[PDB]
Design a protein around this ligand. Structure first.
Ligand SMILES: NC(=O)c1ccc[n+]([C@@H]2O[C@H](COP(=O)([O-])OP(=O)(O)OC[C@H]3O[C@@H](n4cnc5c(N)ncnc54)[C@H](O)[C@@H]3O)[C@@H](O)[C@H]2O)c1
Ligand SMILES: NC(=O)c1ccc[n+]([C@@H]2O[C@H](COP(=O)([O-])OP(=O)(O)OC[C@H]3O[C@@H](n4cnc5c(N)ncnc54)[C@H](O)[C@@H]3O)[C@@H](O)[C@H]2O)c1
Ligand SMILES: CCCCCCCNC=O
Ligand SMILES: CCCCCCCNC=O
Ligand SMILES: [Zn+2]
Ligand SMILES: [Zn+2]
Ligand SMILES: [Zn+2]
Ligand SMILES: [Zn+2]
Lengths: 374, 374
């Protein structure tokens, strides 16, 4: 039995930035009130986890990263009502407390209980459930899924279809929902419009899928890695262009291919140069540009306000605008009904112990999503 | 008889930046095909005209400025069908050709026939109708209303109710429609929401009226000139604050007054510092910020993308988002139906020949709108 007891298990710990993960023996405390301890089944490797390793995203170290995942409830703390032991669940990087200004606002999803803005690396009560070799280890985005077992706040855990294939649906926990929703909920892509998507990783390709689902007439996929073009076309892209093939800035090329600019542009990489190009490539009078990629810590874009005064709309969002706890199970239900597939996005499968190799694949550009199995 | 002939009349010519207008004799050529020659009746002094004088907005010189106005059609060129001699009309700083991508798009209004982006200072055919002292004089925003007579492209002339009081309705030609629409069409202010309006000139006060019409629960008026506060309250502002009274940055003061930030913020001044404060004062998860003011030429804002990634929407627009030719007459009709008044916005009336005194009033902060009569 494990309920009520400290669990001893394995987890991938990041002790220092720019260093490989270390598979360590860790201790996971039992869940407190309103907390859920989950046995991980599958976790996808998202560029966001990589940003901590590269130093592009600041969060307290040492830490157990991981946030795109699916697992089975091992035990629940007192007061928990939405999930029970044995339930299949997906942890959420942005919670849905259902009580704050944001959660009550039908148009927003950045719940005030998030640990995204100025990360503490703890659960919502301000404390940590992990220890390793006598040292406390921080949580990441309230989820810390690169561990055989994690403890998450109830409002950051979604109950899903009991028949869900966890090795596939874990992508719905972050990448797919974020990309797809950025097109459907945030930009609100219109039928017959023209779109441009910068970045063809798991999140960007999910945005291509969203643009297609919304009925876009044209979906221009932009990436410096042409090996991503076949998958982009498979998922809906009408055209694929590599900025390296051109002598002029990509935004000019895009405007000239689209009667002055796209109706909707998406940056799904995380670089200032592509965020600028994305904004510049949407039409000056009726374009909307959405930032999805996570930029390097404290780096600023230099913007002439005239770019917005003509009629542009520039916006950003986390999680594709989906209210997390209510939205993730619905996407799983759609998946179960075969409304969309995730196979094209999952290019590699590896045991959790090979987490480092999974990050090597991400770096090489050979993988879209590598899913790790526990 | 003037039809078909060159008209000799008085106009206010700007020969050099940062210099007073020169009231002098000019010649106005008859209208070409699809052009309309108008006898001016009233013109409002808008900060946009002043931006050319101060060098903050560039347009070819010498030039006849003026764009917020109302007059009577003196003659029309061949092919004109939407107006005829004797009709009361309002010239439009942004045309509505009705045939370009932007005009066809229901969500936009920055018609491709505009002379805003990189001005030519001509009518749509690329030529000028004005001469003075043996030399050609440039047009401004296709309207050049600081003249007893001007020639404007048909698609930039709106026919209005024949009983319209032109000394009042000229404001609908720019300032009122821009401010009001910025709240109603661009931001799409919602009933019960919280708003912050930076700048209480004719345009900003009109944005306050727009927020009230949309049903905002709170409208915080922001201005360093406390003498604009009485009018702001009269028109709907629930609270009025002066940044100069505070030690804390204004965006922080605003967030603390509104549970983390307003739902909708508007910058209606034209300064980079206030554009930044306006963006920062809207809630990070559900706020929308609209740029209305015209910023100084070639000056950029430094923006951390994380400001948008959390869920903010940042946008700009001209003319309050109204499609010019179809929209202005509807607003005049609403005015004639007593749905709104413009009296509070018109603080001074002077004859056209005293245009320089009118600009002195604007510079002094004593006036909201000064209307010049011909
Ligand atoms: N807003 C959110 O809620 C949210 C959610 C998940 C991920 N993210 C962010 O989304 C971004 C994408 O994540 P991912 O996992 O899909 O990443 P990924 O690394 O798998 O994909 C990035 C793609 O961008 C292309 N690319 C890189 N540099 C480029 C350049 N200079 N020009 C053109 N293409 C370039 C790469 O070849 C790759 O195909 C990351 O910044 C991640 O942190 C944000
Ligand atoms: N987007 C458009 O289509 C459009 C249309 C018309 C006008 N405009 C622009 O809108 C802006 C406002 O025009 P207006 O005629 O109402 O101008 P205005 O000069 O009459 O009013 C500006 C107001 O801002 C206040 N102010 C000035 N500096 C400030 C500061 N640092 N902090 C706080 N308040 C400050 C002033 O006291 C004044 O009350 C101008 O930039 C004008 O060019 C834009
Ligand atoms: C945490 C800092 C901002 C990152 C927002 C999205 C990252 N989440 C998942 O990839
Ligand atoms: C888009 C830049 C041109 C000035 C903005 C329109 C302001 N027009 C009238 O006041
Ligand atoms: Zn992620
Ligand atoms: Zn919440
Ligand atoms: Zn047009
Ligand atoms: Zn104006």
């Amino acid at each position: 039995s494990t309920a009520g007891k400290v669990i001893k298990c394995k987890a991938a710990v990041l002790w220092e930035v720019k260093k490989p993960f270390s598979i360590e023996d860790v201790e996971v405390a039992p869940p407190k009130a309103y907390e859920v301890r989950i046995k991980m089944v599958a976790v996808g490797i998202c560029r966001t986890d990589d940003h901590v390793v590269s130093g592009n995203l600041v969060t307290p170290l040492p830490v157990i990263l991981g946030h795109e995942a699916a697992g089975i409830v091992e035990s629940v703390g007192e007061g928990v009502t939405t999930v029970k032991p044995g339930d299949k669940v997906i942890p959420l990087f942005t919670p849905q407390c259902g009580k704050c200004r944001v959660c009550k606002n039908p148009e927003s999803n950045y719940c005030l209980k998030n640990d995204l803005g100025n990360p503490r690396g703890t659960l919502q009560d301000g404390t940590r459930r992990f220890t390793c070799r006598g040292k406390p280890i921080h949580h990441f985005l309230g989820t810390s899924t690169f561990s055989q077992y994690t403890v998450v706040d109830e409002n950051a855990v979604a109950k899903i279809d009991a028949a869900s294939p966890l090795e596939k649906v874990c992508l719905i926990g972050c990448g797919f929902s974020t990309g797809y929703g950025s097109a459907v909920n945030v930009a609100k892509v219109t039928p017959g419009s023209t779109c441009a998507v910068f970045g063809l990783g798991g999140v960007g390709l999910s945005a291509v899928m969203g643009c297609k689902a919304a009925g876009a007439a044209r979906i221009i996929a932009v990436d410096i890695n042409k090996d991503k073009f076949a998958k982009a076309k498979e998922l809906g892209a009408t055209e694929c262009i590599n900025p390296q093939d051109y002598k002029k800035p990509i935004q000019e090329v895009l405007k000239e291919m689209t009667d002055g600019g796209v109706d909707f542009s998406f940056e799904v990489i995380g670089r200032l140069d592509t965020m600028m190009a994305s904004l510049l490539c949407c039409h000056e009078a009726c374009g909307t540009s959405v930032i999805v990629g996570v930029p390097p810590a404290s780096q600023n874009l230099s913007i002439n306000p005239m770019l917005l005064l003509t009629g542009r709309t520039w916006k950003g969002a986390v999680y594709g605008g989906f209210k997390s706890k209510e939205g993730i199970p619905k996407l799983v239900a759609d998946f179960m009904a075969k409304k969309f597939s995730l196979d094209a996005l999952i290019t590699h499968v590896l045991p959790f112990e090979k987490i480092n190799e999974g990050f090597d694949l991400l770096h090489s550009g050979k993988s879209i999503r590598t899913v790790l199995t526990f």
